[PDB]
Amino acid sequence: CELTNITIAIEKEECRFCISINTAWCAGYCYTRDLVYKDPARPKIQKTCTFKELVYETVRVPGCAHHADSLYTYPVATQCHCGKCDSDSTDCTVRGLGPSYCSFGEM
Amino acid sequence: QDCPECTLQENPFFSQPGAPILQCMGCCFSRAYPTPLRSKKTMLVQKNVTSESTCCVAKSYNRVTVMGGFKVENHTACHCSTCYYH
Numbered sequence: 001c002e003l004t005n006i007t008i009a010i011e012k013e014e015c016r017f018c019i020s021i022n023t024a025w026c027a028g029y030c031y032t033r034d035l036v037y038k039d040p041a042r043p044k045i046q047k048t049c050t051f052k053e054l055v056y057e058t059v060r061v062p063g064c065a066h067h068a069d070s071l072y073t074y075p076v077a078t079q080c081h082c083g084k085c086d087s088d089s090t091d092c093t094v095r096g097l098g099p100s101y102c103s104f105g106e107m
Numbered sequence: 108q109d110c111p112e113c114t115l116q117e118n119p120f121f122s123q124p125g126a127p128i129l130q131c132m133g134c135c136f137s138r139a140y141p142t143p144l145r146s147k148k149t150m151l152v153q154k155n156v157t158s159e160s161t162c163c164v165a166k167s168y169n170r171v172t173v174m175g176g177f178k179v180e181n182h183t184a185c186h187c188s189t190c191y192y193h
């Protein structure tokens with residue numbers, strides 16, 4: 001579970017386009033076991049690659065026809081480990097849209 | 108070899124002569140990235156980050172009875188799928 005450079009995608013709903021920032025985040029492998037004996041008394045969250053520390057940033061997002069280009073603040077991974085995704089800040093899913101998902105036009 | 112690929116291993120605590128009892132354990136890919144907008148919207152319960160968990164789990168098991176008089180799962184195939192806890 002290193003900490004590698006990926007390519008997130010920031011978008012302006014109003015302008016039908018997206019910009020590509022090259023920020024750094026988490027990814028890699030972690031160890032887990034599927035208990036052969038499952039005690040009814042849950043649980044054991046199981047570890048996973050994620051963030052330990054995340055500093056924020058901001059960037060310039062071009063505007064267009066009828067909107068002034070603005071500022072966008074995005075999280076950046078400081079250090080990665082195999083902890084337990086912090087539900088109080090993270091949407092822990094099996095499969096998400098992906099860091100570079102661009103929904104040019106909402107809905 | 109830093110993180111051995113998820114596979115079956117004999118579970119010593121429940122294995123017995125001639126009749127073992129395999130278990131899935133090992134590593135699986137995972138990652139975290141900034142939540143895209145389209146989801147941060149459908150997210151009435153707004154979350155700034157997203158993680159794609161994927162722990163090692165049995166693809167199939169028999170579930171046998173053993174020594175202690177209780178029943179354990181006897182895994183026969185494994186794969187990195189979703190984290191459902193136990």
Ligand SMILES: *[C@@H]1O[C@H](CO)[C@@H](O[C@@H]2O[C@H](CO)[C@@H](O[C@@H]3O[C@H](CO)[C@@H](O)[C@H](O)[C@@H]3O)[C@H](O)[C@H]2NC(C)=O)[C@H](O)[C@H]1NC(C)=O
Nearest residue numbers: 115123125126127128129169170171172173180181182183
């Ligand atoms: C838990 O599940 C494992 C599944 O592997 C069981 O072990 C397997 O048991 C079979 C049947 O004895 C072993 O034999 C295999 O099929 C025939 C049987 O004569 C043989 O010709 C094949 O060459 C092959 O060996 C098989 O080797 C064995 N597999 C492993 C990985 O050990 C185990 O018995 C189950 N335990 C319980 C308590 O149900």
Ligand SMILES: *[C@@H]1O[C@H](CO)[C@@H](O[C@@H]2O[C@H](CO)[C@@H](O)[C@H](O)[C@H]2NC(C)=O)[C@H](O)[C@H]1NC(C)=O
Nearest residue numbers: 002003004005006007022023024025026027077
């Ligand atoms: C992603 O993180 C950084 C680049 O952002 C890479 O690590 C070093 O980072 C410094 C700047 O902080 C670069 O000047 C160095 O060139 C990088 N190290 C090396 C050996 O080149 C890191 O390598 C990147 N991740 C990947 C997978 O390339």
Ligand SMILES: *[C@@H]1O[C@H](CO)[C@@H](O[C@H]2O[C@H](CO)[C@@H](O)[C@H](O)[C@H]2NC(C)=O)[C@H](O)[C@H]1NC(C)=O
Nearest residue numbers: 054056072073074075088089090153154155156
């Ligand atoms: C995720 O948590 C909050 C969600 O409430 C995010 O909100 C922050 O950024 C907003 C965008 O400008 C600000 O308006 C909010 O004031 C600010 N929230 C707080 C508590 O400062 C935030 O970006 C993410 N991280 C944190 C630590 O809040």
